[PDB]
Design a protein around this ligand. Structure first.
Ligand SMILES: C[C@H](Sc1ccccn1)C(=O)O
Lengths: 237, 300
């Protein structure tokens, strides 16, 4: 049914699964109109569809034109997400299709279940984990490709860079969620941590810096300290 | 007026005849029910004094045969039977009326309650929901499951109600997923009304029959069916105006007849609040909304 800390290792078994996060699909800025009313201006968004075992992130970019002339966009956005995920699944060969799709927000269950009625064997599930996938847009290369897009577009990213050569998917997912939790809690400091040292760079074909094992431990410790720091500033501890 | 004679009443039992009911004591001189209005389906139903397990009963129409009731001490229940010998049957009934062994169907002349609950119910349609084609009458009880309940187990003893499922490929056109999930008009009007029921009278007949089986037998799958059929209309933006008007009348009398004390099990809070307050038809069920607010405000 739902996903939580008791069955956390299931993410890393050999059943193909995808997380789908729709939190950056419909994005707006809110501004005042000359008449002193408020209006929104949409900006480009993305569906964050991730295989947690492999690190494959199917980043479907949502260009603002998709909203033109449409009403009830927050509701449409969930159905548009479900349509795109369903289109993605259909585009994959059968043996690459997920056996489960885990939505990060429960409002995606019905839209996705309806779009996937053709796939009665694919389980659509919620999760009780608080995953920080909304911070995907704090990753510069992903942010850049979303904001530059002039049309709908699907871009493939490996969100783990080369980490699986050296660590397990369990550890790689744990690192990713720590990095994203940090970026979600204090984006500036998180990025300061990640790029302070100019001698460690991000390869052209990567999203994150080329940290050795020892440097990753330090980075990971600094990110924990940041999350702890913000939790303190937040709650005054 | 017609008569359902009873051979005898060997066990203490509460007998219902449509919305009426009366107690018969073990071996009391009861020989049946007289003055039954012709022109309506009826239901005669039973709840044993010694074992309220299994409410059960028989739908029938007096224009389809001469029916009587006889206790079966092997199966332990009151059985409906047909008498083919017309002369034997009149002779039996007359003898029992002459000795006044029958309760009179107590229809008040101002009262259209039964008509209003059964307006669209037809025995021919009942017999396709309750499959037992060797009898002109149809047995229902408390525990019978529906065809849809068996999919989610004996198929011969099921209620074959029309399957309604809002997250099914029947209900959802490919490429209209959002539209059809949020506005069921396609499912209501093309799939169900034009496709399956042929008309709204047949749809209402099933709806009314589902309600009556829920109320009289506490049949849970019938209550699910009654609520699904209401929800399908309430959740459609485009419903012919005459269907909405008739639906309001139908539901009104159902709500009026429901025991006040059974409201907690027979009424689904989600469907009703949706129908009355959140749905396309939130402003279209005036009579139903007014009785529901005055009689069951707790549900809302
Ligand atoms: C292109 C690969 S990631 C990926 C994501 C989705 C589908 C295929 N591959 C890489 O950059 O290592």
């Amino acid at each position: 049914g739902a996903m939580n800390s008791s069955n956390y290792a299931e993410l890393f078994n050999n059943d193909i699964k995808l997380f789908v996060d729709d939190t950056n699909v419909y994005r707006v800025t809110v501004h005042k109109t000359f008449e002193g009313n408020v209006a929104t201006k949409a900006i480009n968004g993305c569906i964050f569809t991730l295989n947690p075992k492999t690190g494959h992130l199917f980043l479907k970019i949502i260009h603002t034109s998709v909203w033109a002339g449409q009403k009830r966009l927050s509701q449409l956005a969930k159905w548009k997400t479900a349509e795109e995920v369903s289109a993605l699944v259909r585009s994959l060969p059968k043996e690459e299709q997920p056996k489960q799709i885990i939505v990060t927000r429960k409002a995606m269950l019905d839209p996705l279940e309806v779009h996937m009625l053709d796939f009665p064997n694919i389980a659509i599930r919620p999760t009780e984990l608080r995953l920080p996938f909304s911070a995907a847009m704090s990753i510069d290369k992903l942010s850049d490709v979303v904001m530059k897009a002039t049309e709908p577009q699907m871009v493939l990213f490996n969100i783990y860079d080369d980490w699986l050569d050296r660590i397990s998917s369990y550890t790689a997912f744990s690192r990713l969620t720590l990095l994203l939790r940090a970026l979600k809690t204090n984006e500036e400091s998180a990025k300061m941590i990640l790029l302070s040292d100019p001698t460690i760079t991000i390869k052209s074909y990567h999203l994150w810096p080329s940290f050795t094992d020892e440097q990753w431990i330090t980075i990971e410790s600094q990110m924990r300290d940041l999350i702890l720091t913000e939790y303190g500033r937040k709650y005054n501890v | 007026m017609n008569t359902v004679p009873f051979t005898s009443a060997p066990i203490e039992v509460t007998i219902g005849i449509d919305q009426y009911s009366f107690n018969v004591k073990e071996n009391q001189p009861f020989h049946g029910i007289k003055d039954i209005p012709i022109g309506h389906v009826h239901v005669i139903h039973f709840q044993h004094a010694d074992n309220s397990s299994m409410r059960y009963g028989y739908w029938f129409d007096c224009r389809m045969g001469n029916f009587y009731i006889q206790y079966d001490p092997k199966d332990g229940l009151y059985k409906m039977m047909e008498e083919r010998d017309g002369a034997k049957f009149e002779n039996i009934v007359h003898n029992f009326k002459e000795r006044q062994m029958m309760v009179s169907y107590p229809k008040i002349d101002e009262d259209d309650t039964w008509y209003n609950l059964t307006e669209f119910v037809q025995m021919d349609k009942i017999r396709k929901i309750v499959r037992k084609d060797e009898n002109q009458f149809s047995y229902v009880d408390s525990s019978m499951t529906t065809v849809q309940e068996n999919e989610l187990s004996d198929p011969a003893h099921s209620l074959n109600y029309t399957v309604i499922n809002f997250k099914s490929r029947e209900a959802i056109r490919p490429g209209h997923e959002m539209e059809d999930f949020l506005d069921k008009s396609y499912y209501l009007n093309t799939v169900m009304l034009q496709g399956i029921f042929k008309n709204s009278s047949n749809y209402f007949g099933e709806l009314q029959f589902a309600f009556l089986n829920a109320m009289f037998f506490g049949n849970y799958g019938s209550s699910l069916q009654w609520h699904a059929m209401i929800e399908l209309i309430c959740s459609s933006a485009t419903v012919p105006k005459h269907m909405l008007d008739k639906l309001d009348e139908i539901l009104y009398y159902q709500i009026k007849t429901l025991p006040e004390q059974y409201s907690d099990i027979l009424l689904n809070e989600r469907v009703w609040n949706i129908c009355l307050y959140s749905s396309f038809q939130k402003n279209s069920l005036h009579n139903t909304e007014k009785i529901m607010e005055n009689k069951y405000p707790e549900l809302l």
